[PDB]
Amino acid sequence: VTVEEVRKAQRAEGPATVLAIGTATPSNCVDQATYPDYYFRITNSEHKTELKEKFQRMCDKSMIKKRYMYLTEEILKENPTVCEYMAPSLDARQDMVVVEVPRLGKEAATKAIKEWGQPKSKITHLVFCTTSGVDMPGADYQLTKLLGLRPYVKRLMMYQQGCFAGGTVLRLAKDLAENNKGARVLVVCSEITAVTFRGPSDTHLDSLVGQALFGDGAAAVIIGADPLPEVEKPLFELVSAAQTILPDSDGAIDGHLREVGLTFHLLKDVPGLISKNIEKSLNEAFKPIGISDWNSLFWIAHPGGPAILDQVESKLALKPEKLEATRQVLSNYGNMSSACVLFILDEVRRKSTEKGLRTTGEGLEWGVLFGFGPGLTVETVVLHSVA
Amino acid sequence: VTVEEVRKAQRAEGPATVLAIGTATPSNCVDQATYPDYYFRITNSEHKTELKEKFQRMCDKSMIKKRYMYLTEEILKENPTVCEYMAPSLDARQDMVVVEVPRLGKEAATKAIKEWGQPKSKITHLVFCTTSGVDMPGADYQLTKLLGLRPYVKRLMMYQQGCFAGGTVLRLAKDLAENNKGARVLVVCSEITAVTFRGPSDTHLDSLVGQALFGDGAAAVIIGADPLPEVEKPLFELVSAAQTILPDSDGAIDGHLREVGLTFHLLKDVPGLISKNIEKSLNEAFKPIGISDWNSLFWIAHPGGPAILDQVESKLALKPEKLEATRQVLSNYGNMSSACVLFILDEVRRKSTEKGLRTTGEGLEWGVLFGFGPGLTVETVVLHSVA
């Protein structure tokens, strides 16, 4: 037998297809309205009255109503170094997220697999993504053990990538599914802010921004090409996937894993940089297939913060309806990093089904999924809806 | 315009092909024969006679002649916490490797690209792998920046996987190259032991094994499908790629990133586990091809330790010269983790040319590449040589 013959028999035929979506969050629901009172109490910072006033404004303008957090008051009372702005606490943080990340990931994966309707032994690939903690063997191994997947599942562990990774994992699963016949890829993004939670500082307001925006959550997706008729139910098709680094964006967002845990730094105008350059990525993606009206697409954008959405909306003159699904998730979950865009994808097909629309993409044919993160990196995924 | 139409024009035709191999190490060469004297001196443990005696026997049995290490005596003098067995030192270690890992990686990448002969702007994908530190943005961004790759290069950052990742990155690049027409993938593995280096402890001899085996190094590979005639020169073909977790190997190899840096643990007979199970991976991979004689293959195996090679050799009854290239790399470089098999792959084709053999695979047609690591995980890649 020749290599050319193996290649022919080994590869799939059709486009990568989203076959199921499942989501999960911690049980502790934290409402944004009174978070500043709670936050400044548990971090023993109630004497910092002016800084609390600043934080109240941050939360009021975050356009977040609630978040879900693994960290509770009880847990934080047992981990006082985590409550400090900067105290040695990495070990404490790691002990938490090394367990919680794959645990929450399992919940999302179970729901996705349940929707899927196929035996979990049919899962051939696993892409696990997180920005919360690192370990060897990784969370991918732990999840495989918790779920009881086949030991010969082909795993890819994606650590410490940040907010754009939601697009990255789809970009990955696409090539895995399309290049391997019978391949069914379980994608899981799980994020826990226990690694980034910390007390307030008067001279580090960019770190406070994180405390106002980031929430916990996990999302899982099954992806495969050549869907089995009747048995499997396509939701979306992955058409193409691009990644790029924005011009003049060096050091805009930095995150370092230190003895004090994961630190968060903002140096440049992230909303300005994204809105200034995003149309270039839209052109690159959609010019080949003859689309120039961005309002004719159904949208999924990472809600890093409300300012990104507002300025992208303004720059492109998007109708308010376009980013409704995005803003809805931001409102009800906050910024769950890499998992966000998968929650939003789930929201789009939900509202489409509920409204009884022509397609899973709000009745539209083509869509776009955006991830934004450190780099500054922009992930662009072209989507097609299903009837 | 249809999705099906896009897919047909989007994919590549032929098998993923290795077009170039480049390697690099720190300039500081460390002699293994006298390493026990040096190591126990620089870690202020000269008074630990019995332990030093044990370490001398470890080093003598390691079958390593020398290693290359970024860590010099000068650097260790300025970072005393790194010399201790367990002292807070992660920040010091991170400051080192966040820079060195992409620096050494670029050195290897430049060599590969030079052999390749094409413009670096023809690189469409970057797979970067390392077990040495984490940062946001990651080493993949830094490499893209330093090397001057196009901003829209599609990056995959693989952190904290360990020794089996040498096979993982090939499995990855295989799908990226074969599913995307014109795709050319730069794969880079870069490993720096500055994260794991620590002083000796009476009651943690498994950690001491690491100090005897692990060395620094980086390897880079250009991978693509549909090689251009004349201008590009194929070296190997990637036929298939598998991954699996061995039975009853739970917790055989653990690695934890903590405030003392990266720790290393052994709990089970790793050589025994691999040797006992490796033939299952061989059959699973080669029964389809119609091969059952493992001596008809050319071999690349991760030299985790000499014991693994010796027990695999006897278990399969391999002719002694089958693991010649593997042992040669172990002797000259030690265990460079994920980069090892790429050094060995380079050794095989150089050695074959030097012998004037009919193929790049020691004059043979089919070959196998193994990675072993935390899981206990095994990666298996079927290779085909080039005339």
Numbering used by the authors:
A (entry chain A), B (entry chain B): 2 to 388
Question: What did the authors write?
Answer:
Type III PKS catalysis involves the loading of a CoA-tethered substrate onto an active-site cysteine followed by chain elongation via iterative decarboxylative Claisen condensations of malonyl-CoA. Linear poly­ketide intermediates undergo a terminal intramolecular cyclization reaction to produce the final cyclic polyketide product. The five-layered αβαβα topology of secondary-structural elements of each monomer is consistent with the ‘thiolase fold’ originally observed in thiolase and present in all known structures of type III PKSs.
BLAST searches and analysis of the apple genome showed that one of the cDNAs was >96% identical in amino-acid sequence to chalcone synthases from Malus. The crystallographic model of MdCHS2 contained 774 out of 778 residues. The active-site cavity of MdCHS2 is conserved and isomorphous with the previously characterized cavity of M. sativa CHS. The gatekeeper residues, Phe215 and Phe265 in MdCHS2, separate the CoA tunnel from the internal active-site cavity and affect substrate selectivity by acting as a steric gate during substrate binding. Residues of the MdCHS2 pocket include Ser133, Glu192, Thr194, Thr197, Gly216 and Ser338. Ser338 of MdCHS2 resides at the intersection of the coumaroyl-binding pocket and elongation/cyclization cavity and stabilizes the conformation of elongated polyketide intermediates. Nonetheless, displacement of the region B loop is not observed in any available CHS structures.
